[PDB]
Amino acid sequence: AELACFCYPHLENDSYKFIPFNNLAIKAMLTAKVDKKDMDKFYDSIIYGIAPPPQFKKRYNTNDNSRGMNFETIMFTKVAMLICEALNSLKVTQANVSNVLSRVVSIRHLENLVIRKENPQDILFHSKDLLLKSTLIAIGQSKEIETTITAEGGEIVFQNAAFTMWKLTYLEHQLMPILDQNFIEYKVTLNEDKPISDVHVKELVAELRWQYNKFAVITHGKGHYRIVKYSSVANHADRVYATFKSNVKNDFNLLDQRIIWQNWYAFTSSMKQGNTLDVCKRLLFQKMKPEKNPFKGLSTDRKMDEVS
Amino acid sequence: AELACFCYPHLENDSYKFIPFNNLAIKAMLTAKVDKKDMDKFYDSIIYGIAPPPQFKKRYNTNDNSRGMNFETIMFTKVAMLICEALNSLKVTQANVSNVLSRVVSIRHLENLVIRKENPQDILFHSKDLLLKSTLIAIGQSKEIETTITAEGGEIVFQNAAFTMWKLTYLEHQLMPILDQNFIEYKVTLNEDKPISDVHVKELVAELRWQYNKFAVITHGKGHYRIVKYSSVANHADRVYATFKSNVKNDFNLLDQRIIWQNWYAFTSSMKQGNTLDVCKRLLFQKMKPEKNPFKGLSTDRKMDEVS
Amino acid sequence: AELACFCYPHLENDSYKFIPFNNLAIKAMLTAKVDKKDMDKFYDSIIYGIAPPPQFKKRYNTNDNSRGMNFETIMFTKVAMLICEALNSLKVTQANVSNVLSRVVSIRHLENLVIRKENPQDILFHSKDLLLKSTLIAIGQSKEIETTITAEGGEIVFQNAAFTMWKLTYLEHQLMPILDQNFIEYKVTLNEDKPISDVHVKELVAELRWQYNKFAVITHGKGHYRIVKYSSVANHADRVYATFKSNVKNDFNLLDQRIIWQNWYAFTSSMKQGNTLDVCKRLLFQKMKPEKNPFKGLSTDRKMDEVS
Amino acid sequence: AELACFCYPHLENDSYKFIPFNNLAIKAMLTAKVDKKDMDKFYDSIIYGIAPPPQFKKRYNTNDNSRGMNFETIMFTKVAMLICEALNSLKVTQANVSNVLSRVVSIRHLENLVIRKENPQDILFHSKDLLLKSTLIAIGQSKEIETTITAEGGEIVFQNAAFTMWKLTYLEHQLMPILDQNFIEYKVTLNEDKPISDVHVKELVAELRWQYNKFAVITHGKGHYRIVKYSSVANHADRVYATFKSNVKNDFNLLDQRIIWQNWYAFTSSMKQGNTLDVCKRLLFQKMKPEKNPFKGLSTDRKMDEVS
Amino acid sequence: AELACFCYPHLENDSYKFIPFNNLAIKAMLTAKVDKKDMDKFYDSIIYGIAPPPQFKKRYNTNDNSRGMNFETIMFTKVAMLICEALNSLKVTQANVSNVLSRVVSIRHLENLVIRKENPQDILFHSKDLLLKSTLIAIGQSKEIETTITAEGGEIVFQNAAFTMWKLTYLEHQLMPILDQNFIEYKVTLNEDKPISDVHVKELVAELRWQYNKFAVITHGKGHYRIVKYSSVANHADRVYATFKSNVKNDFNLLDQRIIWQNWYAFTSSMKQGNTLDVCKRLLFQKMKPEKNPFKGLSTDRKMDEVS
Amino acid sequence: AELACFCYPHLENDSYKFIPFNNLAIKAMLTAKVDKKDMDKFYDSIIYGIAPPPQFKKRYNTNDNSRGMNFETIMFTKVAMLICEALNSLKVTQANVSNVLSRVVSIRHLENLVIRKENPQDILFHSKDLLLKSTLIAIGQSKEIETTITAEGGEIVFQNAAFTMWKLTYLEHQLMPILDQNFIEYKVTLNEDKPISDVHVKELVAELRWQYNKFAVITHGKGHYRIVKYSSVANHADRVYATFKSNVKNDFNLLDQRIIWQNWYAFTSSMKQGNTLDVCKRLLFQKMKPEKNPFKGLSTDRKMDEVS
């Protein structure tokens, strides 16, 4: 969903400040008949303030839609507030405003930051600065890379000197939860975006080969790993390609070749190199020459440890 | 019910200020034996302050009555407070006090304003002025016409550039809910009491013909439309006539003839013109000459849109 | 129970101030082994402050007793606070302290005052003075008579220009509720302790003959009436006699002879005159010469009113 | 409701046998469009068998009606079965069938008989004959008078050598319960329809004067007494008159003048004598000359007994 | 789903008899690894009997599928029994067996027949013959047309001399309920497959224009009407075309042109005539010349009736 | 627990028949004071029949024990009945009786057979013979090997032409459930105790390497495989050794060396060969020379399949 689904621009003294929509202003708009030349303009509900443009009805769930979001939850408000607090720290101009709001973001990512922010144990609850950083990164207004300290969140299922592995709990979300109850995904952020020693890389591969053998280790090129079911890589390839493709309108970090699943590293390199989707994806469905194992015996050690 | 069922006059420095009754003072009075020459005077419960006049017992529900109100709900207090806050802004005199309190008002309307007032998203929650306006209008102390911004409330089921349609949720009320669970009524206020363009009138008629074909479009002459079941117009005609009739003690806006149901426009014009109830109502039960459709094809467009 | 079951004396600057016991200090004492020469002294639980004298264990309920009170309820605390706040306004001396605390009071009466005090609608919630008056009267430290404004409370089931009738809800109490679920008693206080006109006395007798025909109208001589089941007068006679009898250690208002039940007026007059319990009570169990009805036709009017 | 609301006639070998409707056949009919010349004919739902005539829709509750019965309860079936079992024992002819089914009966009475019938302790559960008698009487096909053994039922609140007093529990019914929760009525049947000794009449009057002083003792002339609130006699007078009036299409037992409320005895005698409703009812609203008490001191004895 | 998803053929004395699968045999098969040359053969679970062919896994719901059926409900068993009881009455041969079982049927239709069959009020509960007829028709083994007496079922919302209208309650189903909670569809069967008088057709059109104005009246050519939302006709056109198209492997009753929605009659005639899907469907999305209303004033009568 | 914890021998005509204990006879015995020379004799509760020997108190759970069984569940009765029905089919002699009853059996195994037996879908519910076979095997009175058809039961998580894999649900048991909620074990029985083709062995190894990589594939030498957590093999080695060791009072099937976990095959062979526990177990905790993979690429195929 676009950032325009949560807030609207109000110019305040040489600069724009962003404001959250009331779920009711949205509800009103969903029932509004609008002229085709006003679908993009902000809607006025008269009773509940400003509402998003009618052309965005699809993003909100109605009886006739479950492909949108649950805007009538407090969470919606919280996520909208989060976005505004970050955009306000930018002081945007009349030339960028629309470009900023038209940016599509991961709502689940924003909800997870709220879960971090509101938790007194989480550091984001204390560092207004780390919170703004984590948010700007998530909403596309930062050149910084997401790392552990600024991760979207979730439950830590493994931590190392170099990495932190999280379990994405998208099933519990209020705003836009995943409907499939078999959904399971993990994210592996770097604690520090610097070079990692072979020993700390070996610890992470052991945990993945042992505790997540049915998962493919991939990435979306933004700096962290994504652990997903093998019966899911195909969809991750499609979405990743789409994004890359939108370069006609864009760097991609392939990450450590000893950690990424062989085929995904292929599918991706063949993408950065230029090849077509069909060419790239074919590299995804073929048994490739097993490259020399960089860390042999990892699974065997674990097994023996477990046995003792 | 009269305004005297919620508050009592206390003269404070050249002016009367109104005060809410405690539900218990009312409960006490309901069990009081009063001399026939004191039925109109305010009752003193000794323990819970002043209570309404004994002649008003009928307005409150007891085991022996369900035709009154549920005064032992917080809502009662809230509605009473609402009324007082508006009457106090008037600074009434010893000559008008009784006339004001003897005014009969729609309790459901007042409860709905409280629902608006207490909602932080609703503008009334913020504009003490819009709130006083909406309330003065509702309690008969304003020459202004109810429009969207000051509507009684309910759920917005359709909004236009010219109108806002509301679903009256009287079934959920605390103070005096409607006992029939098949009750359904809508209200269509004008967003702005000025002339409306044929296109915006056409949008509203389409929504009514399509989404509310089983409803009759009428009005009570106070400026907005009332959408009610056809098996209900008879009662709306009776009540409307009664009111008009009380002119022997009074303007009536017939509204847009292209929107009002043909027969109701007849029944009403025949009322403003002077005719008797029997004469007027007969115009309600007869198949009349289908006046030329001002907007033909409206229902067909909708159907085609739906099909696509 | 004695006032000593709720508070203990702490001399503070030429005067005693009273303090509430913690239910736990009481619980501790109930499990304390005490020397026979300390049963009357205040007990020290070390951990929860001062506790009542061990000789009062009977007043508190334990697994081995239901004839006491439920001291482990907030109510206990509230009632104890109520008592202290009143005793503190007296500034008692080292000569009266024990006499005051050894005074036995009606706990149900004190709980009911708390129910009045904590209710924002009740005047006691506002007049710290009326509250202290109502409490001093209840705990035996006032020469004033209980009247409506200072009544113990309950639910008003009938109000007049002269009286207020209350339903004693002892079944709902927290501190010391009545165990019999068939218990029903009413109290009729005078709104003003002055002479009442025959018409206002007639209204009250009508309500009693009609709405409470199965009840005997009596009094305990302290100024108000007590409405109790006829199968209960015997016990009220016993308790009333006991009290009177304790004159060897004492005025009795027989109240309006047109309102009190004939036999009780007899039983009581024969008591003030001096006669023995046996002599008095015999007057209670004998069909006496029906004295000329002071207000004939009262029941018939009501019946006719009801019929219309 | 008419007997035709539960069963339909099926001629079986020189005689008609009656059959119960399925609640669904009724539900089907309620949604059927019928020609005006078939409103009286039995409706065929095709799927659920025969249903009552469309002209009887009013008798059944729909979303648009609560003035009918709850035909979708097992009770409906049970009551319908009860009626059929009795009508079948009659073996009705083609000349009487319609006359029988057009007979209006008290549904609450029939439900109560089912409650008796299904109770293994109740004698009706055992005597198929007493059950048929009690039912034939209730549905108008018997010259016998209802007495205790064949009463409609309810809870016995007092029994004598001559009478049995029942509390009508119409509030608990499934088929057609009374909506007012303040409803209270009693019925006093004779155990044996013969002359009663003054002592047994005196016992019954004592119980009524003492335990039911707020009730008027009346009758509907069919042989038993009806104990109802005084604020209800007016309605009982109206209904009783209506019935009597339908003599133009009829004996009335005024019962013991020492038990019936003076005014009702008047209102009724003035009815049997011929007078008009207005003339009769006026005798109901006037304080009449207190006829010499046939049993003086009854209330006083009770009071004294209670006191001991 | 195919009939092969519920039963398996067991040749018994010159003839095949069909047998129900145990849900557990199915559960076992879902977890079975099968050779590619056995996907069509019946699977043997050893412990729970025979199970459907592995090539049918898709038809059953697993954690990885909600596009199938809930085979672990009693309903599954019931529906399977229903099918077997009908197929057994046919006595199928070794040449037809596979052809019969490969037939795809509407599961919701079969569940609804079970709901009819198990209801003692429904005639199917009594006529083993009507039940077998209704079932053979539903499973494709009958040349007879579905009519009211043999309809799939649902709730009767309107009945006529010629038709019966049903509300399809697919949302309540156990075996394969519709996941969209906004689903609403009606079916109008003919009570008797013969010619209907214009008056009975007029009654049905009135009910549709008034009570179902937002619905399109269509058919699937098998003899009855289908009432569906206008935003659904497109999908009904697609499915209907697919079926017709499978003629390359087939009669279509267009029904009364005065009842079918104008465009659907077009889309369909253009299909029977031979035209392509694209050609046919285009006739669905275009405002056509309003053919002369065969029954004008129908909606107006209803309105007036309602008003009275 | 021994078979003597469920039944007692009653000689009936040249043969012993076994009888179930009532849980109450057991409860009685648990509270019995017995002479040290009667701990082995059957106890007589007088009121509830015969009970097990007092020396078996340990086997039953009391407030002072959770290391026993929950004999006060219906299950206990069922399991006891199961055992008796099997022992009765043997017709045991006075020389074997004690030897039979002193046999220790797996209670969880017996409960699972009851779960199979009582399930109408399970074949044991139908073949009294397969049931007796499955039971005799479980209680040590059969030379036959447990295979799929006679397995203890559980939930089938994978089935092949040669094997059937079950999930042991010991956490749900009534009689003697496993207290650790992290418990997970699987059992792989042979469908037919004959030689299996390499292809069917390859399918089973693929499923284990992929879906159960964290589990060790072992056996207890009685003919089937046991899938257990690696952090559990140590305990399985101990128990297996104990049993073998009791040969001083005994064949062991090591099963397919391509399926059993390398180390367990070692630990076990070193046991059959004669070595000591210390010698055997050491082979369990050492990284051994990876024997040539008999089926290489199995995990890779699965991964690719999943990806497609």
PDB file of C-alpha atoms in Angstrom, chain E residues 67-231:
ATOM      1  CA  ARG E  67     -10.003 -25.417  -2.597  1.00  0.00           C
ATOM      2  CA  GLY E  68     -11.227 -28.939  -1.849  1.00  0.00           C
ATOM      3  CA  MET E  69     -13.765 -30.482   0.520  1.00  0.00           C
ATOM      4  CA  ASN E  70     -13.948 -31.183   4.243  1.00  0.00           C
ATOM      5  CA  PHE E  71     -13.990 -34.976   3.975  1.00  0.00           C
ATOM      6  CA  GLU E  72     -13.546 -35.421   7.744  1.00  0.00           C
ATOM      7  CA  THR E  73     -17.106 -34.391   8.558  1.00  0.00           C
ATOM      8  CA  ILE E  74     -20.019 -36.786   9.049  1.00  0.00           C
ATOM      9  CA  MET E  75     -21.615 -34.987   6.115  1.00  0.00           C
ATOM     10  CA  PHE E  76     -19.003 -36.433   3.773  1.00  0.00           C
ATOM     11  CA  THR E  77     -20.092 -39.889   4.880  1.00  0.00           C
ATOM     12  CA  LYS E  78     -23.779 -38.987   4.450  1.00  0.00           C
ATOM     13  CA  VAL E  79     -23.250 -37.567   0.964  1.00  0.00           C
ATOM     14  CA  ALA E  80     -21.190 -40.618   0.036  1.00  0.00           C
ATOM     15  CA  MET E  81     -23.953 -42.865   1.311  1.00  0.00           C
ATOM     16  CA  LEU E  82     -26.535 -40.877  -0.642  1.00  0.00           C
ATOM     17  CA  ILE E  83     -24.568 -41.346  -3.873  1.00  0.00           C
ATOM     18  CA  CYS E  84     -24.050 -45.072  -3.286  1.00  0.00           C
ATOM     19  CA  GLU E  85     -27.732 -45.718  -2.556  1.00  0.00           C
ATOM     20  CA  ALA E  86     -28.622 -44.158  -5.904  1.00  0.00           C
ATOM     21  CA  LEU E  87     -25.871 -45.794  -7.958  1.00  0.00           C
ATOM     22  CA  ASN E  88     -26.778 -49.175  -6.457  1.00  0.00           C
ATOM     23  CA  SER E  89     -30.345 -48.853  -7.687  1.00  0.00           C
ATOM     24  CA  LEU E  90     -28.892 -48.614 -11.204  1.00  0.00           C
ATOM     25  CA  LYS E  91     -26.911 -51.849 -11.236  1.00  0.00           C
ATOM     26  CA  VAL E  92     -24.073 -50.550 -13.419  1.00  0.00           C
ATOM     27  CA  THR E  93     -21.942 -52.609 -15.830  1.00  0.00           C
ATOM     28  CA  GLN E  94     -18.205 -53.014 -16.332  1.00  0.00           C
ATOM     29  CA  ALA E  95     -18.510 -50.780 -19.386  1.00  0.00           C
ATOM     30  CA  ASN E  96     -20.131 -47.793 -17.690  1.00  0.00           C
ATOM     31  CA  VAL E  97     -18.630 -47.871 -14.189  1.00  0.00           C
ATOM     32  CA  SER E  98     -15.711 -45.516 -14.931  1.00  0.00           C
ATOM     33  CA  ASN E  99     -17.863 -43.183 -17.026  1.00  0.00           C
ATOM     34  CA  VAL E 100     -20.291 -42.878 -14.104  1.00  0.00           C
ATOM     35  CA  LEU E 101     -17.659 -42.248 -11.423  1.00  0.00           C
ATOM     36  CA  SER E 102     -15.789 -39.729 -13.579  1.00  0.00           C
ATOM     37  CA  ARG E 103     -18.917 -37.588 -13.624  1.00  0.00           C
ATOM     38  CA  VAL E 104     -18.436 -34.249 -11.832  1.00  0.00           C
ATOM     39  CA  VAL E 105     -21.300 -33.208  -9.531  1.00  0.00           C
ATOM     40  CA  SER E 106     -22.305 -30.268  -7.353  1.00  0.00           C
ATOM     41  CA  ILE E 107     -21.383 -31.229  -3.787  1.00  0.00           C
ATOM     42  CA  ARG E 108     -23.445 -28.408  -2.330  1.00  0.00           C
ATOM     43  CA  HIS E 109     -26.438 -29.850  -4.159  1.00  0.00           C
ATOM     44  CA  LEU E 110     -25.839 -33.274  -2.617  1.00  0.00           C
ATOM     45  CA  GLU E 111     -25.427 -31.859   0.895  1.00  0.00           C
ATOM     46  CA  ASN E 112     -28.715 -29.987   0.537  1.00  0.00           C
ATOM     47  CA  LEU E 113     -30.469 -33.237  -0.467  1.00  0.00           C
ATOM     48  CA  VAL E 114     -29.142 -34.816   2.702  1.00  0.00           C
ATOM     49  CA  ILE E 115     -30.585 -31.892   4.664  1.00  0.00           C
ATOM     50  CA  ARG E 116     -33.944 -32.651   2.978  1.00  0.00           C
ATOM     51  CA  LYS E 117     -33.658 -36.420   3.376  1.00  0.00           C
ATOM     52  CA  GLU E 118     -32.889 -36.276   7.104  1.00  0.00           C
ATOM     53  CA  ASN E 119     -35.746 -33.891   7.863  1.00  0.00           C
ATOM     54  CA  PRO E 120     -38.909 -35.762   8.944  1.00  0.00           C
ATOM     55  CA  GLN E 121     -41.061 -32.894   7.659  1.00  0.00           C
ATOM     56  CA  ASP E 122     -39.537 -33.055   4.194  1.00  0.00           C
ATOM     57  CA  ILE E 123     -41.253 -35.530   1.886  1.00  0.00           C
ATOM     58  CA  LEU E 124     -37.911 -37.045   0.790  1.00  0.00           C
ATOM     59  CA  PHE E 125     -37.635 -38.398   4.330  1.00  0.00           C
ATOM     60  CA  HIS E 126     -40.655 -40.532   3.487  1.00  0.00           C
ATOM     61  CA  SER E 127     -40.590 -41.348  -0.235  1.00  0.00           C
ATOM     62  CA  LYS E 128     -37.533 -43.496  -0.876  1.00  0.00           C
ATOM     63  CA  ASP E 129     -38.559 -43.093  -4.492  1.00  0.00           C
ATOM     64  CA  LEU E 130     -38.664 -39.289  -4.610  1.00  0.00           C
ATOM     65  CA  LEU E 131     -35.279 -39.338  -2.833  1.00  0.00           C
ATOM     66  CA  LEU E 132     -33.699 -41.647  -5.410  1.00  0.00           C
ATOM     67  CA  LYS E 133     -35.174 -39.495  -8.180  1.00  0.00           C
ATOM     68  CA  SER E 134     -33.878 -36.234  -6.697  1.00  0.00           C
ATOM     69  CA  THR E 135     -30.450 -37.832  -6.275  1.00  0.00           C
ATOM     70  CA  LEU E 136     -30.174 -39.496  -9.700  1.00  0.00           C
ATOM     71  CA  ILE E 137     -31.040 -36.147 -11.261  1.00  0.00           C
ATOM     72  CA  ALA E 138     -28.364 -34.385  -9.208  1.00  0.00           C
ATOM     73  CA  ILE E 139     -25.626 -36.903 -10.019  1.00  0.00           C
ATOM     74  CA  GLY E 140     -26.292 -36.887 -13.772  1.00  0.00           C
ATOM     75  CA  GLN E 141     -28.011 -40.274 -14.070  1.00  0.00           C
ATOM     76  CA  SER E 142     -31.502 -39.121 -15.025  1.00  0.00           C
ATOM     77  CA  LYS E 143     -33.247 -37.570 -18.009  1.00  0.00           C
ATOM     78  CA  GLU E 144     -35.844 -36.063 -15.696  1.00  0.00           C
ATOM     79  CA  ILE E 145     -35.806 -32.351 -14.910  1.00  0.00           C
ATOM     80  CA  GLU E 146     -35.372 -30.957 -11.408  1.00  0.00           C
ATOM     81  CA  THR E 147     -38.652 -29.415 -10.235  1.00  0.00           C
ATOM     82  CA  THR E 148     -39.886 -28.322  -6.792  1.00  0.00           C
ATOM     83  CA  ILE E 149     -40.727 -31.787  -5.454  1.00  0.00           C
ATOM     84  CA  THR E 150     -37.161 -32.946  -6.262  1.00  0.00           C
ATOM     85  CA  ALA E 151     -35.284 -29.660  -5.704  1.00  0.00           C
ATOM     86  CA  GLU E 152     -31.857 -29.596  -4.010  1.00  0.00           C
ATOM     87  CA  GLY E 153     -33.420 -27.645  -1.162  1.00  0.00           C
ATOM     88  CA  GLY E 154     -32.687 -24.545   0.880  1.00  0.00           C
ATOM     89  CA  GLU E 155     -35.181 -22.177   2.514  1.00  0.00           C
ATOM     90  CA  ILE E 156     -38.456 -21.398   0.732  1.00  0.00           C
ATOM     91  CA  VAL E 157     -38.732 -17.597   0.453  1.00  0.00           C
ATOM     92  CA  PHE E 158     -41.692 -17.533  -1.940  1.00  0.00           C
ATOM     93  CA  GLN E 159     -44.168 -20.052  -3.302  1.00  0.00           C
ATOM     94  CA  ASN E 160     -46.690 -19.907  -6.108  1.00  0.00           C
ATOM     95  CA  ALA E 161     -49.103 -22.181  -7.917  1.00  0.00           C
ATOM     96  CA  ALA E 162     -46.425 -22.591 -10.594  1.00  0.00           C
ATOM     97  CA  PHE E 163     -43.131 -21.938  -8.777  1.00  0.00           C
ATOM     98  CA  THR E 164     -41.199 -22.251  -5.518  1.00  0.00           C
ATOM     99  CA  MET E 165     -38.276 -19.895  -4.811  1.00  0.00           C
ATOM    100  CA  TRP E 166     -35.419 -21.064  -2.602  1.00  0.00           C
ATOM    101  CA  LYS E 167     -32.627 -19.271  -0.792  1.00  0.00           C
ATOM    102  CA  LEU E 168     -29.356 -21.157  -1.252  1.00  0.00           C
ATOM    103  CA  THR E 169     -27.746 -21.346   2.195  1.00  0.00           C
ATOM    104  CA  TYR E 170     -24.316 -22.544   0.995  1.00  0.00           C
ATOM    105  CA  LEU E 171     -22.686 -20.543   3.808  1.00  0.00           C
ATOM    106  CA  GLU E 172     -23.867 -23.045   6.443  1.00  0.00           C
ATOM    107  CA  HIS E 173     -22.586 -26.243   4.754  1.00  0.00           C
ATOM    108  CA  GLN E 174     -20.236 -28.716   6.423  1.00  0.00           C
ATOM    109  CA  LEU E 175     -18.751 -30.552   3.438  1.00  0.00           C
ATOM    110  CA  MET E 176     -17.887 -27.672   1.107  1.00  0.00           C
ATOM    111  CA  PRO E 177     -19.304 -24.303   2.268  1.00  0.00           C
ATOM    112  CA  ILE E 178     -18.847 -21.074   0.350  1.00  0.00           C
ATOM    113  CA  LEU E 179     -16.034 -19.028   1.879  1.00  0.00           C
ATOM    114  CA  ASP E 180     -17.386 -15.602   0.840  1.00  0.00           C
ATOM    115  CA  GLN E 181     -19.848 -14.438   3.521  1.00  0.00           C
ATOM    116  CA  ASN E 182     -21.600 -12.061   1.100  1.00  0.00           C
ATOM    117  CA  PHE E 183     -22.800 -14.962  -1.010  1.00  0.00           C
ATOM    118  CA  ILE E 184     -26.515 -14.955  -1.814  1.00  0.00           C
ATOM    119  CA  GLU E 185     -28.219 -17.004  -4.505  1.00  0.00           C
ATOM    120  CA  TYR E 186     -31.734 -18.201  -5.136  1.00  0.00           C
ATOM    121  CA  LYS E 187     -33.180 -20.964  -7.245  1.00  0.00           C
ATOM    122  CA  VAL E 188     -36.662 -21.022  -8.741  1.00  0.00           C
ATOM    123  CA  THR E 189     -37.944 -24.452  -9.606  1.00  0.00           C
ATOM    124  CA  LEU E 190     -41.213 -25.196 -11.445  1.00  0.00           C
ATOM    125  CA  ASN E 191     -43.680 -27.062  -9.276  1.00  0.00           C
ATOM    126  CA  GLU E 192     -44.839 -28.868 -12.392  1.00  0.00           C
ATOM    127  CA  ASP E 193     -42.961 -28.997 -15.702  1.00  0.00           C
ATOM    128  CA  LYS E 194     -45.952 -27.922 -17.826  1.00  0.00           C
ATOM    129  CA  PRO E 195     -47.201 -24.607 -19.280  1.00  0.00           C
ATOM    130  CA  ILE E 196     -47.843 -21.784 -16.807  1.00  0.00           C
ATOM    131  CA  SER E 197     -50.610 -19.195 -16.980  1.00  0.00           C
ATOM    132  CA  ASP E 198     -49.631 -15.553 -17.476  1.00  0.00           C
ATOM    133  CA  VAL E 199     -51.060 -14.664 -14.061  1.00  0.00           C
ATOM    134  CA  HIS E 200     -48.737 -17.026 -12.182  1.00  0.00           C
ATOM    135  CA  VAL E 201     -45.783 -15.714 -14.207  1.00  0.00           C
ATOM    136  CA  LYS E 202     -46.811 -12.185 -13.352  1.00  0.00           C
ATOM    137  CA  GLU E 203     -46.812 -12.992  -9.624  1.00  0.00           C
ATOM    138  CA  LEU E 204     -43.254 -14.315  -9.838  1.00  0.00           C
ATOM    139  CA  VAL E 205     -41.944 -11.304 -11.797  1.00  0.00           C
ATOM    140  CA  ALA E 206     -43.494  -8.959  -9.267  1.00  0.00           C
ATOM    141  CA  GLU E 207     -41.706 -10.669  -6.407  1.00  0.00           C
ATOM    142  CA  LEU E 208     -38.404 -10.523  -8.322  1.00  0.00           C
ATOM    143  CA  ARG E 209     -38.670  -6.879  -9.398  1.00  0.00           C
ATOM    144  CA  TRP E 210     -39.664  -5.803  -5.900  1.00  0.00           C
ATOM    145  CA  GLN E 211     -37.870  -8.111  -3.462  1.00  0.00           C
ATOM    146  CA  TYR E 212     -34.844  -8.880  -5.647  1.00  0.00           C
ATOM    147  CA  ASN E 213     -34.260  -5.849  -7.880  1.00  0.00           C
ATOM    148  CA  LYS E 214     -30.515  -6.091  -7.425  1.00  0.00           C
ATOM    149  CA  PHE E 215     -30.483  -9.634  -8.772  1.00  0.00           C
ATOM    150  CA  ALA E 216     -30.249 -10.894 -12.340  1.00  0.00           C
ATOM    151  CA  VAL E 217     -32.715 -13.623 -13.306  1.00  0.00           C
ATOM    152  CA  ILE E 218     -30.823 -16.320 -15.276  1.00  0.00           C
ATOM    153  CA  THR E 219     -30.624 -20.094 -15.814  1.00  0.00           C
ATOM    154  CA  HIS E 220     -28.123 -22.825 -16.610  1.00  0.00           C
ATOM    155  CA  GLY E 221     -30.520 -24.443 -19.078  1.00  0.00           C
ATOM    156  CA  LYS E 222     -31.376 -27.444 -16.922  1.00  0.00           C
ATOM    157  CA  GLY E 223     -34.939 -26.389 -16.277  1.00  0.00           C
ATOM    158  CA  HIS E 224     -35.008 -23.966 -13.331  1.00  0.00           C
ATOM    159  CA  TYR E 225     -34.061 -20.311 -12.768  1.00  0.00           C
ATOM    160  CA  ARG E 226     -31.069 -19.051 -10.789  1.00  0.00           C
ATOM    161  CA  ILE E 227     -31.248 -15.694  -9.000  1.00  0.00           C
ATOM    162  CA  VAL E 228     -27.821 -14.129  -8.637  1.00  0.00           C
ATOM    163  CA  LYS E 229     -26.192 -10.755  -7.943  1.00  0.00           C
ATOM    164  CA  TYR E 230     -25.547  -8.699 -11.091  1.00  0.00           C
ATOM    165  CA  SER E 231     -21.890  -8.569 -10.111  1.00  0.00           C
TER     166      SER E 231
END
